[PDB]
Design a protein around this motif. Structure first.
Motif, mmCIF file in Angstrom:
data_model
loop_
_atom_site.group_PDB
_atom_site.id
_atom_site.type_symbol
_atom_site.label_atom_id
_atom_site.label_comp_id
_atom_site.label_asym_id
_atom_site.label_seq_id
_atom_site.Cartn_x
_atom_site.Cartn_y
_atom_site.Cartn_z
ATOM 1 N N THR A 10 7.404 2.580 -12.419
ATOM 2 C CA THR A 10 7.290 3.374 -11.197
ATOM 3 C C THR A 10 6.482 2.692 -10.108
ATOM 4 O OG1 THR A 10 5.445 4.658 -12.032
ATOM 5 C CG2 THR A 10 7.638 5.543 -12.466
ATOM 6 N N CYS A 11 5.712 1.641 -10.396
ATOM 7 C CA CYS A 11 4.952 0.949 -9.380
ATOM 8 C C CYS A 11 5.894 0.400 -8.284
ATOM 9 C CB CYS A 11 4.119 -0.157 -9.988
ATOM 10 S SG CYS A 11 3.184 -1.188 -8.795
ATOM 11 N N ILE A 12 5.531 0.624 -7.019
ATOM 12 C CA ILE A 12 6.281 0.114 -5.871
ATOM 13 C C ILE A 12 5.559 -1.027 -5.139
ATOM 14 C CG2 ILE A 12 7.644 2.197 -5.591
ATOM 15 C CD1 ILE A 12 5.732 2.972 -3.218
ATOM 16 N N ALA A 13 4.519 -1.587 -5.739
ATOM 17 C CA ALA A 13 3.852 -2.814 -5.233
ATOM 18 C C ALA A 13 3.545 -2.641 -3.735
ATOM 19 C CB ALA A 13 4.725 -4.052 -5.505
ATOM 20 N N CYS A 14 2.685 -1.634 -3.480
ATOM 21 C CA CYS A 14 2.322 -1.200 -2.157
ATOM 22 C C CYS A 14 0.989 -1.751 -1.647
ATOM 23 C CB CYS A 14 2.300 0.356 -2.147
ATOM 24 S SG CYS A 14 0.787 1.050 -2.956
ATOM 25 N N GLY A 15 0.246 -2.466 -2.478
ATOM 26 C CA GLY A 15 -1.011 -3.076 -2.091
ATOM 27 C C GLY A 15 -2.237 -2.175 -2.195
ATOM 28 N N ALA A 16 -2.113 -0.905 -2.512
ATOM 29 C CA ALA A 16 -3.244 0.001 -2.357
ATOM 30 C C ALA A 16 -4.325 -0.215 -3.418
ATOM 31 C CB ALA A 16 -2.787 1.451 -2.355
ATOM 32 N N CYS A 17 -3.913 -0.379 -4.678
ATOM 33 C CA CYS A 17 -4.886 -0.345 -5.772
ATOM 34 C C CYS A 17 -5.747 -1.596 -5.858
ATOM 35 C CB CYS A 17 -4.212 -0.077 -7.106
ATOM 36 S SG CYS A 17 -2.842 -1.231 -7.513
ATOM 37 N N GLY A 18 -5.177 -2.759 -5.567
ATOM 38 C CA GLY A 18 -6.029 -3.953 -5.556
ATOM 39 C C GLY A 18 -7.067 -3.890 -4.456
ATOM 40 N N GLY A 60 -5.316 7.188 -4.704
ATOM 41 C CA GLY A 60 -4.594 6.526 -3.632
ATOM 42 C C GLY A 60 -3.239 5.954 -4.012
ATOM 43 N N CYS A 61 -2.848 6.006 -5.293
ATOM 44 C CA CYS A 61 -1.563 5.465 -5.736
ATOM 45 C C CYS A 61 -0.451 6.471 -5.364
ATOM 46 C CB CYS A 61 -1.596 5.221 -7.239
ATOM 47 S SG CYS A 61 0.050 4.706 -7.824
ATOM 48 N N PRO A 62 0.496 6.080 -4.521
ATOM 49 C CA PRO A 62 1.463 7.079 -4.015
ATOM 50 C C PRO A 62 2.428 7.595 -5.079
ATOM 51 C CG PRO A 62 2.112 4.852 -3.348
ATOM 52 C CD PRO A 62 0.748 4.770 -3.934
ATOM 53 N N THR A 63 2.753 6.754 -6.052
ATOM 54 C CA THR A 63 3.760 7.088 -7.055
ATOM 55 C C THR A 63 3.149 7.630 -8.358
ATOM 56 O OG1 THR A 63 3.624 4.767 -7.685
ATOM 57 C CG2 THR A 63 5.481 5.407 -6.263
ATOM 58 N N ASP A 64 1.801 7.769 -8.403
ATOM 59 C CA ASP A 64 1.089 8.211 -9.605
ATOM 60 C C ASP A 64 1.307 7.247 -10.772
ATOM 61 O OD1 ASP A 64 1.577 11.815 -9.137
ATOM 62 O OD2 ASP A 64 0.486 10.368 -7.878
ATOM 63 N N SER A 65 1.567 5.974 -10.461
ATOM 64 C CA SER A 65 1.761 4.958 -11.474
ATOM 65 C C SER A 65 0.459 4.595 -12.214
ATOM 66 C CB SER A 65 2.335 3.687 -10.870
ATOM 67 O OG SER A 65 3.569 3.925 -10.201
ATOM 68 N N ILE A 66 -0.680 4.719 -11.547
ATOM 69 C CA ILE A 66 -1.956 4.503 -12.204
ATOM 70 C C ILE A 66 -2.290 5.743 -13.012
ATOM 71 C CG2 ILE A 66 -4.433 4.183 -11.880
ATOM 72 C CD1 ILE A 66 -3.684 2.356 -9.480
ATOM 73 N N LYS A 67 -2.543 5.533 -14.303
ATOM 74 C CA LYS A 67 -2.902 6.578 -15.234
ATOM 75 C C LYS A 67 -4.388 6.421 -15.621
ATOM 76 C CE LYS A 67 1.611 7.199 -15.343
ATOM 77 N NZ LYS A 67 2.295 8.181 -14.455
#
Ligand code: SF4
Length: 81
Positions: A10-18, A60-67
């Protein structure tokens, strides 16, 4: 204890989490996010001093990919879903 992991499907590689938590999340060879603490296995307890950054990345993860969990994932980002 807290554990964290990225769902690679589900990650869309949006730059937010790094940006939010560079000592927890980075980007793999394909550019997809992953947890550096444990190479995305969800088995290393998040260090005390990184917990607040973890929270910022989680919200801040838009897709809730971070658990985030109180229990290891041991390789399965969907253990709790
Ligand atoms: S914030 Fe979420 S969707 Fe964006 S790169 Fe990180 S894990 Fe992937």
């Amino acid at each position: 204890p807290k554990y964290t992991i990225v769902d690679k499907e589900t990650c869309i590689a949006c730059g937010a989490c790094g940006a939010a938590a560079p000592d927890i999340y980075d980007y793999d060879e394909d550019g997809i996010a992953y947890v550096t603490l444990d190479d995305n296995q969800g088995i290393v307890e998040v260090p005390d001093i990184l917990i607040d950054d973890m929270m910022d990345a989680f919200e801040g993860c838009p897709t809730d990919s971070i658990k985030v969990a109180d229990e290891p994932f041991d390789g399965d980002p969907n253990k709790f879903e």
